[PDB]
Structures are given as structure tokens and as C-alpha cells.
Design a protein around this ligand. Structure first.
Ligand SMILES: [Mg+2]
Lengths: 220, 86
């Protein structure tokens, strides 16, 4: 058990990019997906200024260099969690992409909550689901805002319950409590599809690498 | 008194529909504020009450114009739910 854990769990933590997530994307791919388009300058959020490249005719432009760095970190974290077999829950209240996100979750073997987030799903989880339920080990927000342009209550609840949160934060979002913010465009279908594909690929790579490493260790 | 008669506030009836003529005249007086002015001048509105009423009407107009702007802005979003079910 000791050696197994030491060589399985802690081995990947010794490498900058163990799962090679940087190859999954490039600044050009994000640009082509339009990850760099934000809302009007009037909708801008005070905490999203550091990630905004500028304002092109009252339209904010998200610094895709910072997006690339943040996306690297978020994808690496997600890959490591999937490798460690944690529960990854995808949250998004964008009804335009509810179906897509649910399908991505089902395909990648993780969970999704794209519906009306009932109060207490995380803070009252033991009562709602059962005393032995296992809460998600990572929450990935494809849209950190609810359908009234307020932060998803899941963000606050995840911070409360100490569940790390990856999250795509647009120029009108509040990245303060999101553990791994990925400044980007969460409203374009192209951008949302790119995010879904990236997270799906990273999680699948992590799971398959976990299986491969386990087989390598157990066969010897 | 010293002006010519039948030029001010005079409307000509078309085809004999005095009801339409009176409606047009009433619209004219109301838009010019004469009806409200007469109603308010029936009794003396003391200056403080007049100022309070003017301020209240200005605030009411600001609020109504802003609410109408919001309604007209959001009216487009009264479409059929495109993502019904999901
Ligand atoms: Mg957005």
C-alpha cells in the first residue's frame, strides 16, 4: 500500500506537465474559438480587469496569454484530480449548452449539474443525499454566472465545502472565489465547445494514464 | 382680448363630426397643458406645494421614462423559449 501510493499518487506530482495538457491547445486555437471576446465595457467586473487585454470599441478583449497560462493550470489540476479518481462535477446554467455539457460529462465518466441548483446540494449534502454521500472533489464551472447575471451559488458553496473550482470567467464574472479561473468567452458556442473538448480530453487522458500506470506497477 | 378671435384654440369640424372635433381640441389643450393648468388654477397652490408637486412629477417622469426604456429594451426577449426542456 505504501509503495503503491508513493509511486501512483505522488509520482505525477513530480512533473511540471505529467499529462501533457499544453499540447491540447494553443493561443491560436483559443483565438479561432473566440475565447478572447468579452462583454461590453459597461458589464465589466472590477476583478476581471487584470485579465482584460483592452477595450476594442467598448468591447472587452481578454488577454489570451493569461488565458493560456490559467488554462494550463486548470487543465493540469483537472487531469491530476481525474488521475487520482476524484469526482469532477460540471456546473453550467447556460441552457444553450446544458445538453452538450451533460453529454460531455457522461462521455468522460464524470458528473454534471446543469439544472436549477437547489439550495443545499453541497452544504446540506449529507441530509439531502445521505450521511455517507461523497461530495465532488472538483467542480468545473462552464458558466460561473446563473441566469440572472449573478454568480452561481455553487461557487460560494464549493468555497465553503473546500471543493476546488475550475471556472471559465468572462469579463462580467467574479473570479475571486474560483480556485482556477480561466479568463475566456463563455457565451460563444465555439468557445464553450473548445472548453468542453479540452476538459473531456484532459480527464480521459488522466484516467487512461492512471489505468496504464496501475497496470505497469501491478504487472511487475 | 387684444388679439384676433377664432384663431387661437379653434378647430374646424370635418364632415360634421363635432365629437371628433372636440376630441382633437381636447388633445390639443391637454398636450399644451391648458387643461391641467386650469384644474390647478381653480384653487391657489401655495409655492411650496407647487414646488413639491413639480419635483414629484419630475421624479415620476424620470422613473417612467427609464422603466419604459427598460421594457422596450427587454421586449425582444419575450420570444419563445429556444432551449425548452434543457
Ligand atoms: Mg459570458
Amino acid at each position: 500500500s505504501t509503495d503503491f501510493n508513493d509511486k501512483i499518487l505522488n509520482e505525477p506530482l513530480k512533473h511540471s506537465d505529467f499529462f501533457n495538457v499544453k499540447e491540447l491547445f494553443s493561443v491560436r486555437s483559443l483565438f479561432d474559438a473566440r475565447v478572447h471576446l468579452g462583454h461590453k465595457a459597461g458589464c465589466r467586473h472590477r476583478f476581471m480587469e487584470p485579465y482584460i487585454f483592452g477595450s476594442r470599441l467598448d468591447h472587452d478583449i481578454i488577454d489570451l496569454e493569461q488565458t493560456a497560462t490559467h488554462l494550463q493550470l486548470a487543465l493540469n489540476f483537472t487531469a491530476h484530480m481525474a488521475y487520482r479518481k476524484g469526482i469532477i462535477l460540471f456546473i453550467s446554467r447556460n441552457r444553450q449548452f446544458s445538453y452538450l455539457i451533460e453529454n460531455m460529462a457522461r462521455d468522460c465518466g464524470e458528473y454534471a449539474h446543469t439544472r436549477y441548483f437547489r439550495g443545499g446540494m453541497l452544504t446540506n449534502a449529507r441530509l439531502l443525499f445521505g450521511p455517507t454521500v461523497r461530495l465532488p472533489d472538483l467542480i468545473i464551472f462552464l458558466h460561473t454566472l446563473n441566469n440572472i447575471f449573478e454568480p452561481h451559488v455553487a461557487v460560494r458553496d464549493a468555497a465553503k465545502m473546500n471543493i476546488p473550482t475550475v471556472g471559465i470567467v468572462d469579463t462580467n464574472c467574479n473570479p475571486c472565489l474560483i480556485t482556477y479561473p480561466v479568463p475566456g468567452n463563455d457565451d460563444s458556442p465555439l468557445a464553450v465547445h473548445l472548453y468542453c473538448r479540452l476538459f473531456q480530453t484532459a480527464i480521459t487522458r488522466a484516467k487512461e494514464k492512471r489505468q496504464q500506470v496501475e497496470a505497469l506497477y501491478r504487472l511487475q | 382680448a387684444k388679439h384676433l378671435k377664432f384663431i387661437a384654440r379653434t378647430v374646424m369640424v370635418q364632415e360634421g363630426n363635432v365629437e371628433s372635433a372636440y376630441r382633437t381640441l381636447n388633445r390639443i389643450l391637454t398636450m399644451d397643458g391648458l387643461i391641467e393648468d386650469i384644474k390647478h388654477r381653480r384653487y391657489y397652490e401655495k409655492p411650496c406645494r407647487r414646488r413639491q408637486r413639480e419635483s414629484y412629477e419630475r421624479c415620476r417622469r424620470i422613473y417612467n421614462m427609464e422603466m419604459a426604456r427598460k421594457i422596450n429594451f427587454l421586449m425582444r426577449k419575450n420570444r419563445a423559449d429556444p432551449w425548452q426542456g434543457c
